[PDB]
Enzyme design. Structure first.
Site, PDB file in Angstrom:
ATOM      1  N   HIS A  25       3.785   4.864  17.710  1.00 11.27           N
ATOM      2  CA  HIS A  25       4.682   5.960  17.677  1.00 11.27           C
ATOM      3  C   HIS A  25       5.508   5.994  16.318  1.00 11.27           C
ATOM      4  O   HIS A  25       5.474   6.801  15.497  1.00 11.27           O
ATOM      5  CB  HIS A  25       5.844   5.808  18.840  1.00 11.27           C
ATOM      6  CG  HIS A  25       6.575   6.881  19.193  1.00 11.27           C
ATOM      7  ND1 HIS A  25       7.432   7.113  19.893  1.00 11.27           N
ATOM      8  CD2 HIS A  25       6.383   8.363  18.848  1.00 11.27           C
ATOM      9  CE1 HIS A  25       7.863   8.538  20.006  1.00 11.27           C
ATOM     10  NE2 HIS A  25       7.190   9.054  19.292  1.00 11.27           N
ATOM     11  N   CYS A  60      11.872   0.007  21.551  1.00 12.64           N
ATOM     12  CA  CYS A  60      12.017   1.142  20.615  1.00 12.64           C
ATOM     13  C   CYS A  60      12.032   2.430  21.428  1.00 12.64           C
ATOM     14  O   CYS A  60      13.098   3.412  21.456  1.00 12.64           O
ATOM     15  CB  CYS A  60      10.809   1.229  19.590  1.00 12.64           C
ATOM     16  SG  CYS A  60      11.074   2.295  18.222  1.00 12.64           S
ATOM     17  N   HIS A  61      11.000   2.535  22.348  1.00  9.77           N
ATOM     18  CA  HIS A  61      11.094   3.749  23.149  1.00  9.77           C
ATOM     19  C   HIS A  61      10.651   3.346  24.668  1.00  9.77           C
ATOM     20  O   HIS A  61      10.596   4.044  25.498  1.00  9.77           O
ATOM     21  CB  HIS A  61       9.934   4.811  22.709  1.00  9.77           C
ATOM     22  CG  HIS A  61      10.582   5.840  21.833  1.00  9.77           C
ATOM     23  ND1 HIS A  61      11.058   5.286  20.559  1.00  9.77           N
ATOM     24  CD2 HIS A  61      10.300   7.218  21.975  1.00  9.77           C
ATOM     25  CE1 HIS A  61      11.375   6.467  19.873  1.00  9.77           C
ATOM     26  NE2 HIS A  61      11.181   7.598  20.615  1.00  9.77           N
ATOM     27  N   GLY A  62      10.898   2.119  24.973  1.00  8.27           N
ATOM     28  CA  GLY A  62      10.396   1.611  26.356  1.00  8.27           C
ATOM     29  C   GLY A  62       9.002   1.578  26.697  1.00  8.27           C
ATOM     30  O   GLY A  62       8.733   1.896  27.802  1.00  8.27           O
TER      31      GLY A  62
END
Ligand SMILES: CCCCCCCCCCCCCCCCCC(=O)OC[C@H](COP(=O)(O)OCCN)OC(=O)CCCCCCCCCCCCC
Ligand code: HEM
Ligand code: HEM
Ligand code: HEM
Ligand SMILES: COc1c(O)c(C)c(C/C=C(\C)CC/C=C(\C)CC/C=C(/C)CC/C=C(\C)CC/C=C(\C)CCC=C(C)C)c(O)c1OC
Ligand SMILES: CCCCCCCCCCCCCCC(=O)O[C@H](COC(=O)CCCCCCCCCCCC)COP(=O)(O)O
Ligand code: FES
Lengths: 74, 248, 54, 123, 385, 93, 50
Positions: free
Chosen positions: D69, D88-90
């Protein structure tokens, strides 16, 4: 001498606008405490937290105690 | 990003150096160094501040030649190449508490505590963030948030979980002029000090800025006159048309 | 006249522009410093240096 | 080329090195973690991938941890399977480094590492 | 004859700044060319005096910008006049490319003048980017990583171009050290393309805000537009001096004061505020190869503008519809400079895809259609049949 | 020097406009008239007439787009609330 | 050490000549300094420290 922010944050905590918010956050904190005791909670992957209700309470005290605080400090 | 990942907004505190004519409160930088040396000098470098920058800002010249002789720096080696040390001087820098990066992450549970020499200009919010970060620690997380082990909550940090615990309690330092050393007094004093560490020109920049906007807004208003003066022949020039006879 | 002394010869027009920008340099610098320090009395270093009186 | 040894990486410590200006995420595994890694079905992943084509010697785990990502940083021995958690985003990752829980659409990549005995040529 | 005409050097000064017949009706939008000449000397003179203290290694890049701001006498002036003045370059220039887009200064016989405009605009985007990556901040390392990894989308020649461009395998010491000797240079290529831009102007002269011939009433440049330029010089110096002394870090990002670390990615990498519209065009296409093209096509679509304007009247001054749809284009360009700052979130992807369709349908669909309708309405309003 | 092409501008004397005849151009010296003679009544009455013409060409292109930006920025903040997570799960995927 | 490869020594004769000396590794997970045997990307070490 106690600190200058916490008593000032305590004075705006129990006004009329604050007591409709600090009760509104506490109503969220009870619904968490009955969700944290039900079975199957640790594997639920949708957990309601009260960061939104805490943010409304903390932002109300932030706008009210920002211009008044620095007059207290030497 | 939700509100938790974005961080709570830092409110607008009435600082004593806001406004286009106000300088730093230099009585709060001398009291802001003492909160730095006795609380966060244990785990924060201040790598870019020489000792000579403090002479004439917050401390006098004899006070820095005794504040800098406490630490020990490296000297050029002796007649047989053995490394020797020396007491500091005015031309040296404020030394950090950790000898490398890996010794810093080993003490503070993995997280690297950032150097504070430019931390005011490197954060969205400025001084209103650094003040409200220290005085933003609740007595418990909001009901529903499970922090990772070893991390602390305060909402102004982006994401919630910070790795710094609350290091400002009431009367943990003792000021040299009898100011009451509360948390809100101490967090106000470092944030003015770290603003001086980030912007050591904030007093002279705002008085050369006064000397310029006075000249460059009186030169600009003079030049509107000399433009309108030298254009008065063409601004008020009149034409007439007597249509000629078509015999030609 | 006034024109016959100052603005007639250009050799004495720019002589009293530079002699009027030499006086303006030292006067306007002093009169800004003496205002900008007086606007912030109690906050500068020489006010803290006197208030350390022990 | 980095030349880390074939006897230096411990079992329960997650090595994160900067090879070639890029973060490389290394662990040393146990023989029971080979069948533990691909125990989840391929239908419960957003991409089908087994442990064979990802890691050649499945005891010696060699992973490139630039996430798909943004390039955020997973933390060692954190998450929901004893693998790697990307905060960072799980994006939860297993001991095989594949995306199971999280919005990262692909698995984290593998650099060209080669065994030649008493060394590994990660290049 | 006079010595200003009889000399080989002074007659270039004479025919350009003293005796050049300008039309006597040009408003204050015709000063943005003289400001960009001043704003170029500001960047160049505060580049030489700043690069006497700048070391370009990856270890001493960010530590020697702070050496300028702390240790050099008036060093805070130079670094702030030149980091903010570069952001005033692109604001005067965006008002210079929008005067000429409004008053019809792109049309014939000034297509040669317009094409050197787009060439100067591309080198100025490339100059201000290559100096941004010289501070080696956190937004400038991850700016150069995101930008120069777009060239890894060209088929089969992708990775060999990028690894040549980085000078290594990632943004490392040879990339920053070559992004300085390049960034030193390209201003002297802009300073030569500007001389190749005044020559394309001098053959046909400036336009005028009516869009009619200006050969009838001409006044010289000396003491008329010299002193009409000194108004806006002393104003541009004033609004720069507020943004230098009183609020210097307002335009820049705060994350650029973190020293650049390749191991930790920031929250949201954005470029500086003026590349933010094109960054929203690049991010709008859900493909990597088409994004590099469309972000480059958005600068090159200014070249089809002399051939798509189907109007017999020069400029939008006396037109109702082609003055309304021009300000939709300007406030669409501001909106693309806002979707470039927001994250990739609902609904800023449906907005950034629609508001990049309006950037391209202005030149290709709106301007040929509403200027054909604006020629039949000029005709059948007067002709009685 | 070599002869160049045909341009649409000349110089002083042969500027290349149409031939004009019977146009008299009176003008007074700026030393004999007052500059700033009408700086008031132009900053009030003239500058309102300029504003009265060109403001529905600026406001309506900024009243379509500022309403569009604000009606998305308050829909972005509805999706990222506690009240709009059951709608974000159906539009993000 | 890499320039000697192919000019006057083979590839294994330099990986057994640089592993006689010792250079400064990056420090461990407690910040203590440590040494490592040399590799092909290092310079020939001088005999005096300063
Ligand atoms: C790569 C592609 C490049 C494309 C660049 C995109 C645009 C860059 C943004 C810069 C904005 C510049 C706007 C300047 C517009 C052109 C100048 C202009 O048209 O002004 C004249 C206009 C009407 O004047 P007339 O001359 O037509 O009328 C004469 C009648 N006797 O006067 C007016 O109608 C009023 C002018 C008001 C200007 C408002 C500017 C708004 C700027 C955006 C701010 C956003 C904040 C919300
Ligand atoms: C007056 C005292 C202090 C101030 C003003 C201060 C300031 C800061 C600031 C500005 C940050 C960065 C927060 C951010 O990036 O958003 C930070 C982080 C941190 N601080 Fe402090 N600090 C202080 C004392 C301490 C002390 C005494 C410790 C002792 C262990 C400490 C440990 C840390 C750590 C580990 C971090 C990194 C946390 C993380 O990035 O997750 N700090 N501090
Ligand atoms: C069209 C001309 C120019 C433009 C638009 C321009 C733009 C920029 C920009 C945007 C930066 C980054 C500023 C920051 O973020 O701090 C910068 C930095 C820099 N530029 Fe320029 N520049 C120009 C000309 C020059 C020239 C001619 C030189 C050198 C002779 C130069 C040397 C530098 C240097 C040394 C930096 C150092 C980093 C810093 O302190 O900001 N620039 N420039
Ligand atoms: C460093 C940047 C630039 C400089 C120094 C420069 C210089 C000038 C100057 C001095 C003028 C005459 C004054 C005026 O007409 O306003 C001019 C005119 C013009 N410029 Fe530029 N320019 C620059 C960039 C650009 C760009 C980026 C464009 C368009 C993409 C452009 C397009 C034009 C046009 C169309 C005209 C003629 C306008 C007219 O007179 O009708 N220029 N330029
Ligand atoms: C069409 O009519 C015109 C017109 O003809 C012109 C010219 C202009 C004006 C436009 C320009 C002048 C743009 C041209 C710009 C350049 C050519 C850029 C050149 C600028 C430079 C600064 C050149 C570089 C030279 C230096 C940096 C030398 C300085 C020396 C330094 C810094 C070293 C100092 C060291 C020591 C030891 C003193 C107009 O605006 C205009 O419309 C009214
Ligand atoms: C080079 C990059 C572009 C820069 C854009 C600047 C364009 C305007 C230049 C102004 C020069 C003015 C000289 C005119 C002149 O001498 O007329 C002279 C006399 O004019 C004056 O006395 C003006 C007073 C001095 C003004 C000082 C301005 C300096 C500010 C510099 C800012 C720009 C660098 C002849 O005028 P006259 O023929 O009407 O008699
Ligand atoms: S970094 Fe965002 S999901 Fe892995």
């Amino acid at each position: 001498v106690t600190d200058q922010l916490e008593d000032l944050r305590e004075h705006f905590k129990n006004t009329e606008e604050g007591k409709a918010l600090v009760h509104h956050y506490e109503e969220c904190a009870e619904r968490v405490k009955i969700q944290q005791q039900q079975p199957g909670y640790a594997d639920l992957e949708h957990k309601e937290d009260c960061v939104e209700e805490f943010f409304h309470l903390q932002h109300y005290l932030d706008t009210a105690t920002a211009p008044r605080l620095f007059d207290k400090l030497k | 990003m939700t509100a938790a990942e974005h961080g709570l907004h830092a409110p607008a505190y009435a600082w004593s150096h806001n406004g286009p004519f106000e300088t730093f409160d230099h009585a709060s930088i001398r009291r802001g160094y003492q909160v730095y040396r006795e609380v966060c000098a244990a785990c924060h470098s201040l790598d870019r501040v020489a000792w000579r920058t403090l002479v004439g800002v917050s401390h006098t010249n004899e006070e820095v030649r005794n504040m800098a002789e406490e630490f020990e720096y490296d000297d050029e080696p002796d007649e047989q190449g053995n490394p020797k040390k020396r007491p500091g001087k005015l031309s040296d820098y404020i030394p950090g508490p950790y000898p490398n990066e890996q010794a810093a992450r080993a003490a503070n549970q993995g997280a690297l505590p950032p150097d504070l020499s430019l931390i005011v200009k490197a954060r969205h919010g400025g001084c209103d963030y650094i003040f409200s970060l220290l005085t933003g620690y609740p007595d418990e997380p909001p009901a529903g948030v499970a922090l990772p082990p070893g991390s602390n909550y305060n909402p102004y940090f982006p994401g919630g979980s910070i790795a710094m615990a609350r290091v400002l309690f009431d009367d943990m330092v003792e000021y040299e002029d009898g100011t009451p050393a509360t948390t809100s007094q101490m967090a106000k004093d470092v944030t003015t000090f770290l603003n001086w560490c980030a912007e050591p020109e904030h007093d002279e920049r705002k008085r050369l800025g006064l000397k310029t906007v006075i000249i460059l807004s009186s030169l600009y208003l003079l030049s509107i006159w000399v433009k309108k003066f030298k254009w008065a022949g063409i601004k008020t020039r009149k034409f007439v048309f007597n249509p000629p006879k078509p015999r030609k | 006249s006034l024109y016959k002394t100052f603005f007639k010869r250009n050799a004495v027009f720019v002589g009293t522009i530079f002699a009027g920008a030499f006086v303006f340099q030292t006067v306007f610098d002093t009169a800004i410093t003496s205002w900008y320090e007086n606007h912030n009395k109690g906050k500068l270093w020489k006010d803290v240096k006197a208030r350390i009186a022990a | 080329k980095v030349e880390v040894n074939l006897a230096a990486i411990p079992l329960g410590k997650n090595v994160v090195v900067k090879w070639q200006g890029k973060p490389v995420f290394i662990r040393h595994r146990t023989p029971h973690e080979i069948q533990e890694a691909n125990s989840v079905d391929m239908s419960a992943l957003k991409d089908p991938q087994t442990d064979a084509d990802r890691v050649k010697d499945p005891q010696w785990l060699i992973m490139l941890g630039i996430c798909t990502h943004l390039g955020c940083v997973p933390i060692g021995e954190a998450g929901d399977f004893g693998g790697w958690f990307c905060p960072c985003h799980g994006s939860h990752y297993d001991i095989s480094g594949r995306i199971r829980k999280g919005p990262a659409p692909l698995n984290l990549e593998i650099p060209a590492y080669e065994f030649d005995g008493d060394k590994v040529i990660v290049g | 004859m006079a010595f200003r005409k009889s000399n080989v050097y002074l007659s270039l000064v004479n025919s350009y700044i003293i005796d050049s017949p300008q039309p006597s009706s040009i408003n204050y939008w015709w000063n943005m060319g003289s400001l960009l000449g001043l704003c170029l000397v500001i960047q160049i003179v505060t580049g030489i005096f700043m690069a006497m203290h700048y070391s370009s290694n990856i270890e001493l890049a960010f530590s020697s910008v702070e050496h300028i701001m702390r240790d050099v006498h008036n060093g805070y002036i130079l670094r702030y006049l030149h980091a903010n003045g570069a952001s005033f370059f692109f604001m005067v220039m965006f008002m210079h490319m929008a005067k000429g887009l409004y008053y019809g200064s792109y049309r014939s016989p000034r297509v040669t003048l317009w094409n050197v405009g787009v060439i100067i605009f591309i080198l100025t985007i490339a100059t201000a980017f290559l100096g941004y990556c010289c501070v080696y901040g956190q937004m400038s390392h991850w700016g150069a990583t995101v930008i120069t990894n777009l060239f890894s989308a060209i088929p089969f020649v992708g990775n060999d171009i990028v690894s040549w461009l980085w000078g290594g395998f990632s943004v490392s010491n040879p990339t920053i050290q070559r992004f300085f000797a390049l960034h030193y240079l390209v201003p002297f290529i802009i300073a030569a393309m500007v001389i190749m831009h005044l020559m394309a102007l001098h053959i046909h002269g400036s336009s005028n805000p009516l869009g009619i011939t200006g050969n009838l009433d001409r006044i010289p440049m000396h003491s008329y537009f010299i002193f009409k330029d000194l108004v806006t010089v002393f104003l541009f110096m004033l609004i720069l001096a507020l943004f230098v002394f009183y609020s210097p870090n307002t335009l820049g990002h705060p994350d650029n004061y973190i020293p650049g670390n390749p191991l930790v990615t920031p929250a949201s990498i954005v470029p500086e505020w003026y590349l933010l519209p094109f960054y929203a065009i690049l991010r709008s296409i859900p493909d990597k190869l088409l994004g590099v093209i469309t972000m480059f096509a958005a600068i090159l679509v200014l070249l089809v503008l002399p051939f798509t304007d189907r109007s017999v009247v020069r400029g939008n001054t006396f037109k109702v519809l082609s003055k309304f749809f021009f300000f939709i284009f300007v406030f669409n360009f501001v909106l693309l400079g806002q979707i470039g700052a927001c994250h990739v979130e609902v609904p800023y992807v449906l907005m950034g895809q629609i508001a990049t369709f309006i950037y391209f349908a202005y030149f290709l669909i709106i301007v040929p259609v509403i200027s054909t309708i604006e020629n039949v309405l000029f005709y059948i309003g007067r002709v009685n049949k | 020097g070599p002869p160049s092409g045909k341009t649409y501008m000349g110089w002083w004397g042969h500027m290349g406009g149409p031939k004009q005849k019977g146009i008299t151009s009176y003008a007074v010296s700026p030393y004999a008239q007052k500059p700033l003679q009408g700086i008031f009544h132009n900053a009030v009455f003239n500058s309102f007439r300029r504003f009265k013409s060109q403001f529905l060409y600026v406001l309506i292109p900024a009243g379509i787009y500022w309403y569009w930006w604000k009606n998305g920025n308050e829909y972005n903040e509805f999706l990222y609330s506690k009240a709009g997570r059951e709608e974000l799960e159906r539009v993000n995927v």
